[PDB]
Amino acid sequence: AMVFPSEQEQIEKFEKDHVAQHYFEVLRTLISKKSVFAQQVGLKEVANYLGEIFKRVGAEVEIDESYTAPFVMAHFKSSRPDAKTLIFYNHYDTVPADGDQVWTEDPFTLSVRNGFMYGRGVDDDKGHITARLSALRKYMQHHDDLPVNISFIMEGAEESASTDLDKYLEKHADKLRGADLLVWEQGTKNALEQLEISGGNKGIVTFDAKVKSADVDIHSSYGGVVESAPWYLLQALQSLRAADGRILVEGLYEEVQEPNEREMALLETYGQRNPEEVSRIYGLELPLLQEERMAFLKRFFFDPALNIEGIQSGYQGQGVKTILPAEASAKLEVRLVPGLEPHDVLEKIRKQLDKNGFDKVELYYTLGEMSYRSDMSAPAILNVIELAKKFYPQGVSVLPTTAGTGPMHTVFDALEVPMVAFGLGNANSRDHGGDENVRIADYYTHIELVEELIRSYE
Amino acid sequence: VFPSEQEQIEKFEKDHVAQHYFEVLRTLISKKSVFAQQVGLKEVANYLGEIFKRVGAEVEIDESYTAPFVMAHFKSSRPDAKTLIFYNHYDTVPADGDQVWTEDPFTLSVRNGFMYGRGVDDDKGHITARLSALRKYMQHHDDLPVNISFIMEGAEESASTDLDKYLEKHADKLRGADLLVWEQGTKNALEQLEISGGNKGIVTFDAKVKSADVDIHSSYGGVVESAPWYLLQALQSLRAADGRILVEGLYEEVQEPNEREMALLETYGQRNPEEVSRIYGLELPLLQEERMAFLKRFFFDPALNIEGIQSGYQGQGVKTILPAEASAKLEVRLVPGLEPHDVLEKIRKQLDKNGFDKVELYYTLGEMSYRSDMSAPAILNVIELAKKFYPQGVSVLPTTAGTGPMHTVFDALEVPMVAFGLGNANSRDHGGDENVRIADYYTHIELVEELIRSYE
Numbered sequence: 001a002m003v004f005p006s007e008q009e010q011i012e013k014f015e016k017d018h019v020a021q022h023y024f025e026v027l028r029t030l031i032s033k034k035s036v037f038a039q040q041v042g043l044k045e046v047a048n049y050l051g052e053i054f055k056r057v058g059a060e061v062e063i064d065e066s067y068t069a070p071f072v073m074a075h076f077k078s079s080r081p082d083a084k085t086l087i088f089y090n091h092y093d094t095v096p097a098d099g100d101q102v103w104t105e106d107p108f109t110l111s112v113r114n115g116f117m118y119g120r121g122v123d124d125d126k127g128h129i130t131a132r133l134s135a136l137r138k139y140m141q142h143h144d145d146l147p148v149n150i151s152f153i154m155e156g157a158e159e160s161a162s163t164d165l166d167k168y169l170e171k172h173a174d175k176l177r178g179a180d181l182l183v184w185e186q187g188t189k190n191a192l193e194q195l196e197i198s199g200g201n202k203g204i205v206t207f208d209a210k211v212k213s214a215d216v217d218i219h220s221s222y223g224g225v226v227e228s229a230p231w232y233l234l235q236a237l238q239s240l241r242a243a244d245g246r247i248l249v250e251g252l253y254e255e256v257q258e259p260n261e262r263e264m265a266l267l268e269t270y271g272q273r274n275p276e277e278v279s280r281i282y283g284l285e286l287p288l289l290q291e292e293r294m295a296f297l298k299r300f301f302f303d304p305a306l307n308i309e310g311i312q313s314g315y316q317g318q319g320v321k322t323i324l325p326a327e328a329s330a331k332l333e334v335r336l337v338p339g340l341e342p343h344d345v346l347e348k349i350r351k352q353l354d355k356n357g358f359d360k361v362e363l364y365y366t367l368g369e370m371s372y373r374s375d376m377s378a379p380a381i382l383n384v385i386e387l388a389k390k391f392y393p394q395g396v397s398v399l400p401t402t403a404g405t406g407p408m409h410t411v412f413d414a415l416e417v418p419m420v421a422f423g424l425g426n427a428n429s430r431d432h433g434g435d436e437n438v439r440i441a442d443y444y445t446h447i448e449l450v451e452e453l454i455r456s457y458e
Numbered sequence: 459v460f461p462s463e464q465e466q467i468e469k470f471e472k473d474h475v476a477q478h479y480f481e482v483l484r485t486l487i488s489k490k491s492v493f494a495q496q497v498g499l500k501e502v503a504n505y506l507g508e509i510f511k512r513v514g515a516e517v518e519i520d521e522s523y524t525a526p527f528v529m530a531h532f533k534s535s536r537p538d539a540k541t542l543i544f545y546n547h548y549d550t551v552p553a554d555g556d557q558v559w560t561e562d563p564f565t566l567s568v569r570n571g572f573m574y575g576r577g578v579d580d581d582k583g584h585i586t587a588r589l590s591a592l593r594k595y596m597q598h599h600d601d602l603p604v605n606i607s608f609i610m611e612g613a614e615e616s617a618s619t620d621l622d623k624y625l626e627k628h629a630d631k632l633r634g635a636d637l638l639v640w641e642q643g644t645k646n647a648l649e650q651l652e653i654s655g656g657n658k659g660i661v662t663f664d665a666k667v668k669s670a671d672v673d674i675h676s677s678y679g680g681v682v683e684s685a686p687w688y689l690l691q692a693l694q695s696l697r698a699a700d701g702r703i704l705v706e707g708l709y710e711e712v713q714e715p716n717e718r719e720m721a722l723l724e725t726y727g728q729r730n731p732e733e734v735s736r737i738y739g740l741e742l743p744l745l746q747e748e749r750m751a752f753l754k755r756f757f758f759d760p761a762l763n764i765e766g767i768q769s770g771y772q773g774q775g776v777k778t779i780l781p782a783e784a785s786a787k788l789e790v791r792l793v794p795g796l797e798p799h800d801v802l803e804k805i806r807k808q809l810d811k812n813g814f815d816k817v818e819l820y821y822t823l824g825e826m827s828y829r830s831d832m833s834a835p836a837i838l839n840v841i842e843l844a845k846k847f848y849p850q851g852v853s854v855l856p857t858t859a860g861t862g863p864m865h866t867v868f869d870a871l872e873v874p875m876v877a878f879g880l881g882n883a884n885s886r887d888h889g890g891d892e893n894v895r896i897a898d899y900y901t902h903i904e905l906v907e908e909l910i911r912s913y914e
């Protein structure tokens with residue numbers, strides 16, 4: 001028997017809440033200050049501003065400027081002895097406004113229209129920073145002390161693969177290790193307005209593959225006797241993957257951590273009802289590689305995948321060109337799951353190609369990110385799940401991992417604290433797109449959930 | 459017994475007829491004639507028309523289709539005289555981009571005992587050398603002992619567009635001939651004159667796959683099939699590791715080589731398959747390694763080739779997409795018995811049967827194949843005459859691996875066909891600094907003159 005406020009009620013609460021309003025003006029200022037890692041613009045400016053903001057309400061603040069993007073930490077202390085610690089991880093850099101992106105109003109001007117707030121960073125990730133601070137300060141309106149120690153860590157290079165995050169966390173692990181729970185930088189409601197509460201990221205390894213079959217393109221009259229670069233490469237790739245998408249590389253699945261019973265039960269309960277709908281959404285013309293719902297979800301969340309991002313050889317254009325191309329190349333990737341490390345995955349692929357008779361395929365490592373997940377059974381995570389249900393009428397969607405890539409493995413490796421992601425995004429927030437937005441009611445609801453999480457530590 | 463190269467060059471220098479047509483060649487080369495660019499076609503056809511008319515030939519320039527068809531007939535007075543036909547083309551490929559040209563491609567240049575220019579080998583030089591041979595003969599005899607017809611088309615480099623129609627129209631003036639001499643021929647790397655009697659064929663076509671409306675984030679790569687995987691799977695289902703084509707009903711249509719054809723291969727085919735590996739710097743094993751297996755595959759079997767394939771992202775860095783589209787440019791090299799349209803339809807059926815109905819196929823070009831076992835007496839005569847002019851001997855092959863209109867010409871004319879000419883293994887047809895050895899050019903003249911004399 002749970003009752004929930006209406007969207008109209010949430011918006012009025014938001015309008016009447018002096019603390020939420022104070023930090024909404026702070027959000028306006030933050031959005032206005034462009035902070036992009038890849039344009040080197042405004043990182044120190046935003047990191048210092050955040051420093052002042054948190055100092056004002058009594059946090060002990062440290063701004064480490066050792067690497068390109070300053071690393072901001074703000075610790076709020078509880079007077080309770082044997083108090084636990086809560087960590088909020090967030091980032092203050094955003095992607096550029098840019099491209100063929102359509103903006104109704106200036107991307108760096110926080111704009112409110114039709115019950116949504118618009119601006120570069122309102123969802124990813126600055127809005128999450130002002131909402132979580134709002135929550136703490138609201139709790140502080142009605143209490144003399146915090147029931148739990150609270151640490152905010154804000155990096156400035158999340159959109160450029162969290163450059164040097166590993167070096168900041170190693171440097172400051174002593175103050176962070178041992179916390180009860182770490183809440184991730186963002187989260188969203190899904191298409192059914194269920195709050196997604198997730199516990200992992202998949203990883204990836206990307207690499208170039210190249211073949212040189214001869215010193216020059218040869219006349220195609222020789223194609224019956226002379227092997228060409230594209231045939232060799234097609235044969236090589238075809239050797240590494242079954243028609244159902246299973247990867248044919250020895251040693252690879254042996255390293256994969258299989259999902260436990262809880263993880264499989266979570267998928268059953270919370271995974272999309274009809275994942276076969278991707279066919280409609282993208283106008284697929286070929287059948288899915290895995291069609292039954294659970295086979296599909298399990299492949300999607302818990303299996304790796306060998307992907308061709310591009311392949312090219314010989315002649316493109318109008319007309320013909322009677323050649324056996326000397327060179328062929330491809331841009332490949334393997335999506336990873338826990339157990340699989342980028343360099344090692346590539347070495348197993350080198351070995352299998354050599355064993356298959358394709359030693360002339362050259363491989364060149366380009367990028368890697370490690371994967372991470374949990375079965376969402378840590379009691380600190382269970383607490384979050386039960387509290388969230390009191391705030392979202394459509395309920396929650398609990399997932400061991402999302403299919404996105406991110407720094408979760410880096411963070412857990414340094415800090416070893418249980419991690420959970422939830423936030424104030426909507427399925428159509430357009431992160432990284434034009435008119436990035438957050439629903440005003442969703443933003444206020446995240447404040448209330450975070451304040452309730454703090455109260456749960458009393 | 460055989461003249462030296464130095465003697466040949468001197469003979470060439472002192473021969474007023476050869477020198478006259480060598481200046482004619484200079485002019486032909488200077489006039490760019492490329493079918494694909496529709497440049498110079500009427501200009502070169504008209505100029506040739508006049509060159510032949512001047513020496514008393516009965517000339518017809520048919521301008522019905524894009525490239526004018528030129529015919530020049532020289533009559534013998536002998537009443538039961540046979541007829542000899544020369545087929546040649548006056549169009550060339552362009553000079554081009556990546557190609558290295560020491561001097562202007564459209565300026566005949568002589569260096570180190572070679573002549574250089576676009577068309578000196580393929581095919582303008584063959585035209586002037588053959589008219590030289592006829593006219594040289596006429597310096598020493600009262601009349602031709604055989605009727606001689608020159609047929610010159612201007613679309614050979616573009617698959618002989620409308621040749622078939624011109625031959626249908628003029629077949630009454632041409633059918634009944636004793637022998638037809640093909641457009642060009644070369645000496646092989648061992649300086650043996652190649653004498654051949656066939657062209658392989660070709661069917662080229664685009665293959666395309668659309669797998670979705672849009673490029674999808676590659677995180678879906680374990681559940682959504684992409685266009686490039688589907689296409690690689692389709693292409694691989696059609697070709698065995700050893701190059702054999704896996705298409706039902708294809709090999710059934712292949713005409714097997716007879717005993718003479720195989721014996722010719724064995725005698726005159728390359729001595730060593732592995733030389734190809736050395737020449738091209740091959741980094742992969744040959745698809746057929748034993749000599750006779752290699753040779754039979756090269757001249758007498760079809761082959762499925764990828765000229766190009768592309769999909770998704772090329773460029774700096776990565777792009778986390780499953781591409782929605784992939785395409786390829788394919789061809790099947792053909793042998794007698796295989797027709798372009800039928801071959802492509804058999805590939806359509808196999809792909810559907812194999813589960814690849816979504817690969818789209820678009821026919822783009824086709825040429826039928828042709829060959830003979832080189833036993834026609836009119837052809838044997840050429841093989842014997844040639845042994846008197848080339849100290850390294852001759853190389854007799856039923857077919858070259860190149861493509862050409864032999865099938866179209868035979869279908870209209872039904873005259874025994876033989877290819878021999880003035881190129882060298884390094885003439886670089888279709889390439890930069892295309893060239894003919896001066897001595898080789900004059901030797902061709904003398905061999906063609908002797909061919910005429912053999913009809914007395």
Ligand SMILES: OC[C@H]1O[C@@H](O)[C@H](O)[C@@H](O)[C@@H]1O
Nearest residue numbers: 257258259260373374375376
């Ligand atoms: O049960 C063993 C492990 O299985 C993994 O798949 C889960 O992500 C872990 O949280 C769990 O500890």
Ligand SMILES: OC[C@H]1O[C@@H](O)[C@H](O)[C@@H](O)[C@@H]1O
Nearest residue numbers: 084180379380383456457458
């Ligand atoms: O008290 C708040 C929460 O703190 C976590 O450390 C405990 O594991 C939960 O059981 C508890 O509900």
Ligand SMILES: OC[C@H]1O[C@@H](O)[C@H](O)[C@@H](O)[C@@H]1O
Nearest residue numbers: 713714715716829830831832
């Ligand atoms: O023996 C039958 C036929 O075999 C074919 O392979 C040859 O090209 C023909 O010249 C011959 O007439």
Ligand SMILES: OC[C@H]1O[C@@H](O)[C@H](O)[C@@H](O)[C@@H]1O
Nearest residue numbers: 540636835836839912913914
């Ligand atoms: O007379 C020249 C040649 O004409 C051909 O028609 C005959 O078949 C040959 O035997 C002869 O040598």
Ligand SMILES: [Mn+2]
Nearest residue numbers: 124125185186
């Ligand atoms: Mn983010």
Ligand SMILES: [Mn+2]
Nearest residue numbers: 580581641642
């Ligand atoms: Mn030619």
